[PDB]
Amino acid sequence: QPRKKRPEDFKFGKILGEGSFSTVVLARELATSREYAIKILEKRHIIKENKVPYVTRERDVMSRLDHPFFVKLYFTFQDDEKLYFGLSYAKNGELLKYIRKIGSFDETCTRFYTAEIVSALEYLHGKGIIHRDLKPENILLNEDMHIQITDFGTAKVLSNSFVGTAQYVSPELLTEKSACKSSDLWALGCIIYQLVAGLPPFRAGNEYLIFQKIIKLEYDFPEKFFPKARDLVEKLLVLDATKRLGCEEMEGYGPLKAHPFFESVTWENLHQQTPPKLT
Amino acid sequence: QPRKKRPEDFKFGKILGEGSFSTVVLARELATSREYAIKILEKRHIIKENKVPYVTRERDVMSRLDHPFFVKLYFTFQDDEKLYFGLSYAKNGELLKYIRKIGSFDETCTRFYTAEIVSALEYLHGKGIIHRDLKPENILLNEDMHIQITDFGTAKVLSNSFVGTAQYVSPELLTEKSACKSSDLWALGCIIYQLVAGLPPFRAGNEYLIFQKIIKLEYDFPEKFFPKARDLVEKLLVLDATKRLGCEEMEGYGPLKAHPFFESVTWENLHQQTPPKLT
Ligand SMILES: NC(=O)c1nn(CC2CCNCC2)c2c1CCc1cnc(N=C3C=CCC=C3)nc1-2
Numbered sequence: 177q178p179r180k181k182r183p184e185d186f187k188f189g190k191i192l193g194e195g196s197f198s199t200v201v202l203a204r205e206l207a208t209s210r211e212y213a214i215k216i217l218e219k220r221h222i223i224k225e226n227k228v229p230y231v232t233r234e235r236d237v238m239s240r241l242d243h244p245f246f247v248k249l250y251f252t253f254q255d256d257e258k259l260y261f262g263l264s265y266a267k268n269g270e271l272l273k274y275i276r277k278i279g280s281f282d283e284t285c286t287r288f289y290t291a292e293i294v295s296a297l298e299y300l301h302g303k304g305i306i307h308r309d310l311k312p313e314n315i316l317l318n319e320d321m322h323i324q325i326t327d328f329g330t331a332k333v334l335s336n337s338f339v340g341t342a343q344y345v346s347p348e349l350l351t352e353k354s355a356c357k358s359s360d361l362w363a364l365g366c367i368i369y370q371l372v373a374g375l376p377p378f379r380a381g382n383e384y385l386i387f388q389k390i391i392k393l394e395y396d397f398p399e400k401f402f403p404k405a406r407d408l409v410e411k412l413l414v415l416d417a418t419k420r421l422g423c424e425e426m427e428g429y430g431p432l433k434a435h436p437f438f439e440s441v442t443w444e445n446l447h448q449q450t451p452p453k454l455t
Numbered sequence: 456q457p458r459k460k461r462p463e464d465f466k467f468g469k470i471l472g473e474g475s476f477s478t479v480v481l482a483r484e485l486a487t488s489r490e491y492a493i494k495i496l497e498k499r500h501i502i503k504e505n506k507v508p509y510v511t512r513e514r515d516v517m518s519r520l521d522h523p524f525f526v527k528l529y530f531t532f533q534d535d536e537k538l539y540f541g542l543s544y545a546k547n548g549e550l551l552k553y554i555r556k557i558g559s560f561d562e563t564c565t566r567f568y569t570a571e572i573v574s575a576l577e578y579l580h581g582k583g584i585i586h587r588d589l590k591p592e593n594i595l596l597n598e599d600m601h602i603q604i605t606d607f608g609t610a611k612v613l614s615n616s617f618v619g620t621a622q623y624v625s626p627e628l629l630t631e632k633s634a635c636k637s638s639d640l641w642a643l644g645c646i647i648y649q650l651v652a653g654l655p656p657f658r659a660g661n662e663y664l665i666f667q668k669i670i671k672l673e674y675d676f677p678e679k680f681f682p683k684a685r686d687l688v689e690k691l692l693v694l695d696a697t698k699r700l701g702c703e704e705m706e707g708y709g710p711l712k713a714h715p716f717f718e719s720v721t722w723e724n725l726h727q728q729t730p731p732k733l734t
């Protein structure tokens with residue numbers, strides 16, 4: 177291994193994000209000029225808040241990922257007070273930013289980015305890992321406009337407890353306190369809807385009211401919604417977790433990737449394809 | 456760590472190179488579509504030829520390198536017969552190919568590529584590692600036309616034995632059977648000469664005759680040779696290894712990088728600069 181890095185090996189720059197248990201700062205490694213997104217965590221605060229298992233799991237999951245559509249963990253170190261995780265820097269920020277910038281994605285762009293997300297999930301679920309907080313805020317865009325999925329703090333490694341962002345919460349988490357690969361597939365359905373409609377499907381004044389719409393499958397499609405994309409969403413936003421397209425009970429990613437909405441997709445080498453320009 | 460890769464995780468393609476103890480093949484990882492240059496070594500042949508220390512050292516050195524101007528080792532595995540080293544793939548091949556293609560480099564191109572090599576050597580020598588076989592054949596170009604230095608089989612980790620390619624052999628290897636950081640600096644002088652002149656400085660009908668010219672410092676500069684580049688070469692091709700610019704006895708890379716030939720170079724972020732077009 178290269179000798180352990182230290183804070184003094186980097187020139188730290190702007191803060192990219194501030195979480196409850198961490199801060200992500202852009203850093204330039206002096207010896208190389210390379211930019212990393214360095215996630216910084218305070219050991220005392222992690223201990224106080226009983227987050228050792230979560231931080232441990234985050235590091236362990238990221239160490240297992242080796243795929244172009246995921247954030248890469250390059251190095252870790254620590255000083256007396258802090259843990260530092262050296263991550264890939266995705267220069268273009270949140271997918272959510274582009275949804276808002278252009279309002280909604282046309283069909284070509286919806287297809288391409290949905291295909292990248294499905295392909296990332298196939299990889300992740302193949303490793304028996306579930307994300308549990310998938311949303312446009314956690315799906316970043318690199319300099320080449322390919323996705324990089326981030327935020328593995330709340331991931332689960334398959335062998336209750338955590339519920340992610342309200343708008344993307346699957347009904348089984350609300351009704352049975354239980355998560356599975358299918359919870360990510362529900363979130364995928366919500367994300368596809370958001371790409372096409374410009375907004376997530378379940379929206380209300382507060383969390384309780386959102387949860388109420390989720391468990392009743394209370395959402396509708398706007399008129400212009402790409403018909404094949406609507407059919408795919410209807411196959412993902414299914415209350416029964418065992419009937420969601422892509423899940424093991426529905427025989428996996430084969431049938432999901434075979435959906436008519438993806439007819440023109442070449443699944444083999446998405447990361448080497450040029451992304452369509454966002455309007 | 457990601458679970459160990461296997462040959463069946465890759466579609467192997469063309470042979471990029473065939474050495475005495477290894478073959479490098481271009482491979483595409485099925486799960487990711489990523490291309491790697493996979494160096495393949497036959498355990499039986501390595502054992503027969505007493506190369507275990509060299510292969511061991513090669514792996515150990517590459518594992519220590521984390522710099523944009525060096526080949527990266529991404530993974531290793533083995534089957535019953537073979538060792539596999541997953542390396543970065545430099546798509547544009549040997550620097551030597553461009554020297555031959557354009558005949559010789561203009562001053563701007565000579566400066567930029569010499570600066571990348573010096574910056575790579577500063578990194579490498581800072582880790583107490585010496586290359587010992589530096590030449591345009593071992594300096595590759597990536598897709599963005601930045602260098603990637605390869606071939607660490609014959610490297611030495613500082614704490615006799617090996618002499619590299621005849622034309623780049625330093626006089627102390629011939630006279631004292633001894634290597635040091637300064638042997639790489641001699642090779643750098645030969646490479647700069649080759650960039651500007653189109654041919655290496657010491658040339659003869661056979662190895663003996665080459666070695667004879669090296670120990671007598673028998674070479675000359677063609678008329679048009681960039682004056683400041685000539686001055687730099689004269690400071691590197693010095694028979695006394697302790698008087699070569701860049702060596703510890705001459706106070707290191709500071710004075711080398713300060714040479715007038717590099718006046719307009721920004722040393723900080725060469726890998727993020729756009730390389731000058733080769734004529
Ligand atoms: N929580 C994280 O792991 C994380 N948080 N950020 C910062 C923002 C990302 C989008 N949502 C709010 C937090 C990162 C990461 C992973 C590693 C990572 C890599 N690159 C970026 N890039 C950004 C570029 C522009 C704006 C924000 C982030 N960001 C991160």
Ligand SMILES: NC(=O)c1nn(CC2CCNCC2)c2c1CCc1cnc(N=C3C=CCC=C3)nc1-2
Nearest residue numbers: 471472479492542543544545546548549592605606
């Ligand atoms: N010996 C090695 O380690 C090695 N050999 N090659 C193949 C040729 C390189 C130039 N000299 C003859 C052997 C490689 C490597 C490192 C890893 C490596 C990475 N990328 C390339 N790329 C090439 C592209 C076009 C032609 C040849 C090589 N090559 C290699």
